[PDB]
Design an enzyme around this catalytic site. Sequence first.
Site, PDB file in Angstrom:
ATOM      1  CG  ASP A 130      -2.271   0.677   0.934  1.00  0.00           C
ATOM      2  OD1 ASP A 130      -2.443   1.214  -0.220  1.00  0.00           O
ATOM      3  OD2 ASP A 130      -3.178   0.613   1.852  1.00  0.00           O
TER       4      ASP A 130
ATOM      5  CD  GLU B 293      -2.408  -7.763   4.648  1.00  0.00           C
ATOM      6  OE1 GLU B 293      -2.321  -7.203   3.525  1.00  0.00           O
ATOM      7  OE2 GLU B 293      -3.398  -7.565   5.409  1.00  0.00           O
TER       8      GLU B 293
ATOM      9  CE1 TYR C 230      -8.219  -3.224   7.018  1.00  0.00           C
ATOM     10  CE2 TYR C 230      -7.126  -5.334   6.622  1.00  0.00           C
ATOM     11  CZ  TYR C 230      -7.090  -3.985   7.025  1.00  0.00           C
ATOM     12  OH  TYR C 230      -5.923  -3.366   7.426  1.00  0.00           O
TER      13      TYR C 230
ATOM     14  CD  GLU D 201      -2.758  -4.360   8.109  1.00  0.00           C
ATOM     15  OE1 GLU D 201      -1.558  -4.653   7.873  1.00  0.00           O
ATOM     16  OE2 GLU D 201      -3.613  -4.244   7.191  1.00  0.00           O
TER      17      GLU D 201
HETATM   18  C1  E8X Z   1      -8.775  -8.486   0.699  1.00  0.00           C
HETATM   19  C2  E8X Z   1      -7.486  -8.239   1.457  1.00  0.00           C
HETATM   20  C3  E8X Z   1      -7.320  -6.744   1.688  1.00  0.00           C
HETATM   21  C4  E8X Z   1      -5.925  -6.486   2.257  1.00  0.00           C
HETATM   22  C5  E8X Z   1      -5.876  -4.996   2.509  1.00  0.00           C
HETATM   23  C6  E8X Z   1      -5.297  -4.671   3.870  1.00  0.00           C
HETATM   24  C7  E8X Z   1      -3.939  -4.040   3.715  1.00  0.00           C
HETATM   25  N1  E8X Z   1      -3.020  -4.770   4.606  1.00  0.00           N
HETATM   26  C8  E8X Z   1      -1.686  -4.155   4.520  1.00  0.00           C
HETATM   27  C9  E8X Z   1      -1.723  -2.668   4.853  1.00  0.00           C
HETATM   28  O1  E8X Z   1      -0.412  -2.146   4.615  1.00  0.00           O
HETATM   29  C10 E8X Z   1      -2.718  -1.933   3.957  1.00  0.00           C
HETATM   30  O2  E8X Z   1      -2.853  -0.515   4.183  1.00  0.00           O
HETATM   31  C11 E8X Z   1      -4.065  -2.594   4.156  1.00  0.00           C
HETATM   32  C12 E8X Z   1      -5.064  -1.789   3.354  1.00  0.00           C
HETATM   33  O3  E8X Z   1      -5.295  -2.074   2.187  1.00  0.00           O
HETATM   34  O4  E8X Z   1      -5.654  -0.718   3.881  1.00  0.00           O
END
Ligand code: E8X
Lengths: 597, 597
Positions: free
Chosen positions: B164, B411, B466, B502
């Site tokens: 990101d 991740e 999320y 997160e």
């Molecule tokens: C469907 C999976 C979504 C993953 C998205 C979650 C991401 N995790 C890593 C962080 O660095 C990002 O900011 C986070 C996001 O996008 O705000």
Amino acid sequence: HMLRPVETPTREIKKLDGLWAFSLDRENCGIDQRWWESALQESRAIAVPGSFNDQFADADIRNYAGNVWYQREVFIPKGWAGQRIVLRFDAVTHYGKVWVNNQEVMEHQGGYTPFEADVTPYVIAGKSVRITVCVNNELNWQTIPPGMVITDENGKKKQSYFHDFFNYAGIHRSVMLYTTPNTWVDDITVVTHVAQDCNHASVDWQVANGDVSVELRDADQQVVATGQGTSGTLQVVNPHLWQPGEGYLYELCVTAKSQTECDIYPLRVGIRSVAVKGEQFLINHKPFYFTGFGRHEDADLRGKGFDNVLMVHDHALMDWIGANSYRTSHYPYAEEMLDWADEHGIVVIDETAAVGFNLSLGIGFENKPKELYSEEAVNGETQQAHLQAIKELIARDKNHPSVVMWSIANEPDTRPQGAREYFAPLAEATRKLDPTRPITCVNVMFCDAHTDTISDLFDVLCLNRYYGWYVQSGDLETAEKVLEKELLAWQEKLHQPIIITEYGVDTLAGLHSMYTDMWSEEYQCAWLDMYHRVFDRVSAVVGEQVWNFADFATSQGILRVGGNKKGIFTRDRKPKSAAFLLQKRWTGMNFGEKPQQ
Amino acid sequence: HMLRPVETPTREIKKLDGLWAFSLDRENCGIDQRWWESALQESRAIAVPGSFNDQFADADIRNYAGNVWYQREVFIPKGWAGQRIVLRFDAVTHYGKVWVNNQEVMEHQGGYTPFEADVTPYVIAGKSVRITVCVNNELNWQTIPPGMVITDENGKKKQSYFHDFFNYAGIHRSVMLYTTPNTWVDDITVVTHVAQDCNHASVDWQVANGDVSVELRDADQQVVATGQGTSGTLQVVNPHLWQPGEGYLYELCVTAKSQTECDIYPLRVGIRSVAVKGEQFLINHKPFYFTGFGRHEDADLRGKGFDNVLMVHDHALMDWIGANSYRTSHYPYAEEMLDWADEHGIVVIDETAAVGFNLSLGIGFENKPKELYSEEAVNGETQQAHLQAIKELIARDKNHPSVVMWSIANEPDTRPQGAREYFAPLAEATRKLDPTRPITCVNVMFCDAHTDTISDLFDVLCLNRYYGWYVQSGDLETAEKVLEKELLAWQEKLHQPIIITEYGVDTLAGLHSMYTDMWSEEYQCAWLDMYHRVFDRVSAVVGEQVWNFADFATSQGILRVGGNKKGIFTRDRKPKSAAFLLQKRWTGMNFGEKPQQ
Ligand SMILES: CCCCCC[C@@H]1NC[C@@H](O)[C@H](O)[C@H]1C(=O)O
Ligand SMILES: CCCCCC[C@@H]1NC[C@@H](O)[C@H](O)[C@H]1C(=O)O
């Protein structure tokens, strides 16, 4: 004598419906050239009801002072050959003069109350007549509200006034033609008395060449009382009372029989008693506690124009937040508002348009009459115009059970001798025009307990207080002390119930602060909260009304960041954080009852 | 072998201080033309530490891919004739190669950890040498983090990556020259054991031609233990423990005596024990509960550049809100952060820069290696580079008592076979590089309980979830059910402690909604609240970290409205409404203890 139009022997065709021809008159030749004669030149479509200022996104139409012309043709319905037909304007802001096809038929001063004329002789039923309206948006010292017109070297009129909200003008509400039988009810008056809450009557007094009988029908439409007599009656009853939480309505229907034709008028009634005793405001012999808002008739694009979706949505919000009351801040509202208030049991402080009788609440660094009460400023004609504004407001909203108090004015400067000379006769005249409701005059901050001159001429004391905002700015500790001290001073001085009809702080939606500094959502929350802690410590305070429900438009200046931002909601009705603060207090309290802390 | 510079036989002159000459190299001729030879052409002042992207408000410098040159002259202090002098770069983001006046002295890959070289032979003490730095901001599949450089038809390099946050580059932290005696401490290792909380020792193991003795001085500077031996010791002690709320620090000072000169190194130690038992994370044999944030090193104008005021202010905010822990999200932070964490008893999850090992979290409607684990993508060299990133992170933060867990990656996509092949050796290598701390790998949403492949190779399970945002969008009812179901599934499958590292929702400051729809402050509050109600119903969850403490910059795309807005604070550190939500929960709970609901 005026009533709101409704049905069966009576019927409306509203010209609210739709677009009218509209024109400015920058050199004021419309009257000379008798524009009502022909269909207008230079005409553009405009929507009625609605202000003319915001509709064209043009600063010159917006900032115009003068006359504007509204004109539309309409087909007069033909099954109306034998009944009597009236032309009713529910509001023309400031002044309006109408021609019904080369025939002046009405004229009115006062931008917030309806005015009608019988037009039977001047129209051909079954064909179309042309309606021309001349609207003036100018304010002088004899208008309610007062203002001064400033003409520059080139004859451009620019209007100055002494109130916050923007001077929107135009046809703000309903324009309709309606027919009654040639024998018709012309005015009604209903009064309610109640003793041990299961036992009283509804006095009546009616008025147009018709013998009258009145049935008092149920919500179930079951009849439980009957009378006859142009001079009314006392229908005695064991009843279900009009209460703040629910607002039950009987229906008193008056039957005006002439020996040939008949007319009947349906009028809803709420059986409730209002009174003041010591420092207590009682609806049906119980001490009520007011919560809610000062409001405004202001909204995007339409200005002060009435809109049904807005009424539905704003009442949904007010219901959600827990408000039980509101004040029709700074002018009489649309009657549809008060009708909604009746059906829903909302307690209302009804207020005239007498705002700005004060020449001390200015922005700075800029030629006024140096004596507020005098021949140059607020003088005898102003007093007569004010009394007439009180008479029109009362004649229109007397029967509404939701109206629970009359507001004569908002925030006049009471310090000069002559404030009491101007106001005392109006206070008396108002009591004699409706002895059944308490009377109030909203009091400005700098006319403190020691200096105020006229508050003892009224039943209820309504304070507008802004400590920690306009003075002691940012200082919640000092302002708390000042607010407590002045509230106890007022209770000591008058032992009347106190409503804080205005308390609020300008707040930019989305500005946040880890300090609690002004213009921030955090500050709006902490300031309202400090006020609430004080109110809860003064026995005499029976009501709180946060200054504004929503952000509204004002004239331009260095004090107003795109208008007044003291709203709890934005102008598009989105909530600032303080909305949830309010919802917690107002829904967490026992209904209508003062928070036990 | 590396330690953080400090004082008395050692002394710094930092060139952090101040403006350097800076230049781009759009055709990459700087190396050919040996720019380190002369003082640069085309040089503009730039501030160090600090990213180069935001400093000039120019989108071309901002979006540059290639090499940039930093150059400054400095006067080497003259009382440094007989001591040994080192040039230390605390961070050069991605890659840096330094010349000390026509003499390449260092080179480094890895934008987040320090790298130093002895420069004694190559400098004249008492006069000024010229420092030239070549900085590369490019990422390929063997860099930590991975990326791909896209070269267009005209040779303009544009960098794509799979994480990101924005790919800020430059000299982000401290650049300093410091002197140690020619007999000096070169590395230290301290380990703490504790039994009934009043009774254990501090193992040591030291390393540079010097006989060593260690005094364990008090906060009062009272000595209570003493040892000698290059191979260290076990100083046994009855003590006051390093706790999460307070973070007591002893001072273990190592004395390196050569028969002529001496060197001594002060190293603060926190006496505490970390372990995992069943589904419990214990600091000093009590089950801890984590609260706090994922953070970022991002801020206005300076990008990822370290700034003292920012550290003071962000810790004030985090302290206020009630956070007790944080994760150094997606790269090792400035050591000043971990030092602050030690003095204040903040629990830290330390994480490498291994982010973006996943080619499924994309924006849509747009050429990648179709096998994540393969020779084209994440291959053996990537693994070696990753292990080296783990070794550098651990060598720098091993002694910090605040670091309580090591994060290998964030991740990755674990579904392909070869994820376990890539990760298992790294998990093992990490345990053997520090057996005293638990090990974790942060797990992405779509690698659910059923499909994830590698989580059983780690001690603690850290979930990024999320639901209700990226899936079941807007649906708090459905998302609540899904979140409960997957958390119970994870606890059933691994019986490890679960931290939600997160959870967060994009929120525009000042957007408000009477519905609870996405991007609104009301939705951020209701969503965090629903997560909190679920966490409180799953015994295995021992920690919550709201995804972001503040809004931060990302690369441009349709998913990011001026960056990532999942912050609780804005990028200028002003609080959204949810901040008070957090403050209520986190200050209303017993410290470090899971909310009893
Ligand atoms: C469907 C999976 C979504 C993953 C998205 C979650 C991401 N995790 C890593 C962080 O660095 C990002 O900011 C986070 C996001 O996008 O705000
Ligand atoms: C020092 C006295 C200040 C009076 C100011 C309070 C005013 N009362 C009347 C309302 O119509 C105004 O909006 C309010 C204000 O300005 O927001």
